[PDB]
A paper describes a structure:
As such, BiBga42A represents one of the pivotal enzymes underpinning the symbiosis between bifidobacteria and breastfed infants. BiBga42A has a three-dimensional structure similar to other GH42 enzymes that have three domains consisting of a (β/α)8 barrel (domain A), an α/β fold (domain B), and an anti-parallel β-sandwich (domain C). Glu-160 and Glu-318 in BiBga42A were predicted to be the acid/base catalyst and the nucleophile, respectively, based on previous studies of GH42 enzymes and sequence alignment.
Therefore, we also replaced the acid/base catalyst Glu-160 with alanine and performed co-crystallization with LNT using the preparation (E160A/E318A double mutant). However, LNT was also hydrolyzed during the crystallization under these conditions, because only the electron density of the product Gal in the α-configuration (α-Gal) was observed in subsite -1 of the active site. The asymmetric unit contained six molecules (two trimers) of BiBga42A. The pyranose ring of the α-Gal adopts an undistorted 4C1 conformation, and the C6 hydroxyethyl group takes a gt conformation. The O6 atom of the sugar forms hydrogen bonds with the side chain nitrogen atoms of Trp-326 and His-369, while the axial O4 atom is recognized by Arg-121 and Glu-366. The α-anomeric O1 atom is recognized by the side chains of Asp-285 and Tyr-287 via hydrogen bonds. The side chain of Phe-356 makes a stacking interaction with the hydrophobic C4 region of the pyranose ring.
Author numbering:
A (entry chain E), B (entry chain C): 1 to 691
The structure:
Amino acid sequence: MEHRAFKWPQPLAGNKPRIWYGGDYNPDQWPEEVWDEDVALMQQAGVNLVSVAIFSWAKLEPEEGVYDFDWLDRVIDKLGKAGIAVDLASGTASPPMWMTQAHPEILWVDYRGDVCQPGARQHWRATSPVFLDYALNLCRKMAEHYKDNPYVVSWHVSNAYGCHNRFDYSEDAERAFQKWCEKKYGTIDAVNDAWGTAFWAQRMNNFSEIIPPRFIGDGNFMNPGKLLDWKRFSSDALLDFYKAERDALLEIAPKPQTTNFMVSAGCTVLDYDKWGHDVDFVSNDHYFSPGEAHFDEMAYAACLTDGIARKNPWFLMAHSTSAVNWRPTNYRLEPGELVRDSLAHLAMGADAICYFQWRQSKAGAEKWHSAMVPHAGPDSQIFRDVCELGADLNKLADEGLLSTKLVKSKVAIVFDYESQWATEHTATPTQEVRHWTEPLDWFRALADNGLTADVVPVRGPWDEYEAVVLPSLAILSEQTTRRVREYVANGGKLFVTYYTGLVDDRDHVWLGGYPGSIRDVVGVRVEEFAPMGTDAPGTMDHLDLDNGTVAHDFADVITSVADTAHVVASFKADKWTGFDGAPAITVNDFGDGKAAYVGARLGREGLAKSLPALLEELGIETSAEDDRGEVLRVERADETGENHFVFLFNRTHDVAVVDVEGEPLVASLAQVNESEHTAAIQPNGVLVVKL
Amino acid sequence: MEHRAFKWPQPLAGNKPRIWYGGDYNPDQWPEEVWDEDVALMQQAGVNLVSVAIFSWAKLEPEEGVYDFDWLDRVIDKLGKAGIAVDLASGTASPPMWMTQAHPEILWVDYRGDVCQPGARQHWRATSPVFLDYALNLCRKMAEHYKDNPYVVSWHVSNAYGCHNRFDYSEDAERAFQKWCEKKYGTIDAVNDAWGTAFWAQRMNNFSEIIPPRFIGDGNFMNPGKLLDWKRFSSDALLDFYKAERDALLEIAPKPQTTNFMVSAGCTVLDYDKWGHDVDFVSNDHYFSPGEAHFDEMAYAACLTDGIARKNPWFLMAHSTSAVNWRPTNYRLEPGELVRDSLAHLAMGADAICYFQWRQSKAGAEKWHSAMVPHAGPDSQIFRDVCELGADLNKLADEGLLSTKLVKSKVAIVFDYESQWATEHTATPTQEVRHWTEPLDWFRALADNGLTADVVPVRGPWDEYEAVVLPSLAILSEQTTRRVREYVANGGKLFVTYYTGLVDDRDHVWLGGYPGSIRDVVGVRVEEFAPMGTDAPGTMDHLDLDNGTVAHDFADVITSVADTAHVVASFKADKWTGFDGAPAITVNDFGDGKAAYVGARLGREGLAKSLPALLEELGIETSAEDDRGEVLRVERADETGENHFVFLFNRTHDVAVVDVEGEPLVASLAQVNESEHTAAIQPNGVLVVKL
Ligand SMILES: OC[C@H]1O[C@H](O)[C@H](O)[C@@H](O)[C@H]1O
Ligand SMILES: OC[C@H]1O[C@H](O)[C@H](O)[C@@H](O)[C@H]1O
């Protein structure tokens, strides 16, 4: 896999490079006189880019073969005249009513054969030929019309593919899946082997016997190999649609182009790292996680985004000023979080900061979603903070932040979309264990130990790092196995955890003892698992460790430890459980490297407490200060190292005090003491320094 | 109802009778070189029977009308020559893809009309004539081919009927249900009366107006008499299918034949006692209940299996060496439980001990289900315990265990599949009360008081016992009523609980006060119920009793007690409830016997504490020992008494001390003190002795 060449949206003629600042703009939802008020307010706020026409198909093509562009010409002109750049959409995110009325075969079909209707959005099949013809047609009309518009700086292709239409079970999907399987496997016997079809009379004579994983009765168990391929296929079918639209636009109007991802700790609707290879620049939608996890999970997701972009600058396409509309309980943001959240994504390497949306809708299903201009209007704390943020971004651009990169960490935490899919089967050891939670737990625990990790997709250069975490990385292919073995052999410092390396990329178990492909590297052998929980009276729901930590949900049964290895921590338990004195945490010497195995789920807190002794043995340096977990430190720098920025975020509900090590440029809820060269950072506060 | 003559699978020429030991064997999932390792490991383990071809249809008939037997002939010859017998499947458990592609009408239909697809197993309609054709054809091909094979000791017809295909709502089912109703009732007027169809305008003019209980809207209320008959019909249709396959194998290849049941405390997909009349020997699958109930519920289930078998030896077709795959959290087994669990089924009368499965699948939906040979291979604690168990079963057969029977208890606990169905309606007094939990509660509480009960299906000879429990036995027919009355009148000691005798076998309520067919027998009259729970603030969630116990979920409102009866325990409550000082537990003198009435759910704990007084009133003797409930004592003996075995299982997490009353044969996590003639049984331990 090669990436496309990097391309970034360029300034309007006569403008200098800025951190792009703005949001989705939907003037089609407002009387025309509002657009001038919009433009005045945008200039006040320091907004310099908006994303237009994303769901405007029914206005752009109001009946088949009739096109209406004048309204959009006029808004683009207003914006451009005022010095505001337009990120223009294909307009193909969701079809108009006329089209699905005429062609119901466009509508995706669920696992039971029920047809998703219009009434919301993105109700189209990824593999519909009819819908592709309509999408490519609008793409060509749009590219033809805006080819020479100097105010349009980039293409926003469709919108968040697969958010609603990830899975289709129609005849189109059935045929496409068959062809996808022929292309991957060549022969039906290679499919029979991969999926283990000798089990339960599933063996197929030919590729026409491959059906999608449709309804099989509630609570019954689908073929796991097949269901993993179904997820890979579904991602790939949408990726092919993206490529088609992308290609139809660029053939006519070559401009920097992206499509917006949905990278967050727990969102795996697509293999976003694979998709990263086909965008010109990575753009992402991220919304805060409610409660205590808000800051850490956002910094993590932004970190992953940077990792998908291979440390190139990236584009925050969407986040919220305050509440969203789509949770059961739509918590608002607290004072300071607007500025802080935006500066967090920026610190993780974004050169653009954009919201959904500019102006809060007064009608429709997202009327309750926050905006930059709330229902309350610009006499509001939200808009004041938006303007403050505008001025902050202008300041950081002035001081040279643009094109700097997220500094390389000591530690790469590995993420694999496919490993997450493997852990989603309904007949694994426990539904309570998925891939995705572990890398996040480790990011938080390393931050508690004063270390900001990088998060690196499994295809990416994790093997170039001082230290690497494999966090519940269920899949290890032959290839990844070899990369792991050699990494350690040649000086690598590895952490491996439970639920890592169970299977290969066909979802076949590595035999002989878990983790079956790398027992030599970790220096342990696991014969079986001990899932934990509380779903009946008297189930085992925890295991204490002799290092003052407690395991929940899952523990390995380690039955041997190599001679090159030693036990760092052991379980304490009732004798009849088998776990008393059993190994929990181990470190192994392998070539010139070391590998630690963490044989149970310890959570953030457990990991955080377990880590000092492991980091010491593996030779990973951190601060000794007991306050090192209070702030998250995030650095951007150019290649020289001359333009070097440090972002410091309070992670706590206490006042955090830090050294100021340069010129302070931005201070949200932070007060510097010039003479003592110190700063007190309030809760939800941030200080930005240039070294 | 007649049972079939008992037949048991016989040894291979030249072998002595043994406790059949082994499991499901799936060579078709492995390279043929692996079969040699399998056979060597089976011999090391003392395995002497395997169950083959259960899901092998796609290999035996890889296309319509093409048969491939050679692989199977070879595997069978490898086994038989190594002294391992073969329980051969009909292969008809689940159809291959080519068959359902060609004949979609085979596929069962859910209540909403959505067709169950292939992708897991058993996706066929019980009443499909085309599927019957295919299944009988393969039966005959297999019978014709293996009728003179001397290594095939029995037939395993299909597999676990109804586990996935209990209910079908297709046109086939509709027509079959009409004919079923006409056979049972004769006239549409008799159906109308049974189902109470004057209510809600449901009266039918003819049999063509009967439809299955299909979708009526979420939360709406099906006609209860029809639903009960639907569950009766569903079990009967699968039974007719089983009999057709059976008769087709046996007309060609008369060998001993069974089909595996799923008897456990809570599983009632079929009337397994009824199905018990059509097997030659009873076989069963049972998997452990997680947590505290593991040991007790397994013993209870084994006990019920023995009851269904009418005290003939029976075949444990499946259980697990450790974790299963199909729970949300798949807990492992603790040290010693492999052996103990097997010995529990044995103590309760099994002459065969078999596992799912011999070797752990490395691919497919049950890859995480434990086995006799784990992924880790034969160098494993599981394989060592499998080998130790094999030796123990050889030892026990050498000492004369075979064909001994579970000793007749003082107490029969009555179980009625149909009564559980009656309690399943959505408009009962409370969804918290079902038939099934009460017999289990009584079994455990009787064990707390040092008595091992028998569990006897309602059709079975419970009226021959010293004492009898009717536990939430919601149906009492006229015939069962007469049997209960005559039992007590002639000297029986009866325990009757709440939710007993509400309805007849048509689900019509017995009028005049509950329980309305037997008020004279129990000497009480219930006017109404008081369900209890916590589903709004301030609901009544318990009622204390003056014997130091607490009722939950349900209490009866007893408003009169007969002159022949007296009150043993009363409720204590806030006065506004109406329950302060009301009767809770009574005893009535009726003819030469007694009937105790327990008018609330006391649970295991409350029943345990209540039982000393009740046992004394009813003249049922038990130990006086404080420690009488620490251990479950299970006994098997021949008709003479000459071979008399005692199994002693620790039920606790303490060391149980016991008296050794014969020769110790098997001691798992138990230590005999020779000279004191005592033994220390560790948690999860068991001692087996011959007197
Ligand atoms: O949070 C809601 C918001 O989510 C994403 O960013 C979408 O692309 C937007 O159109 C909107 O639906
Ligand atoms: O525990 C899993 C196991 O359950 C039963 O015993 C079935 O008959 C087997 O085929 C298998 O599915």
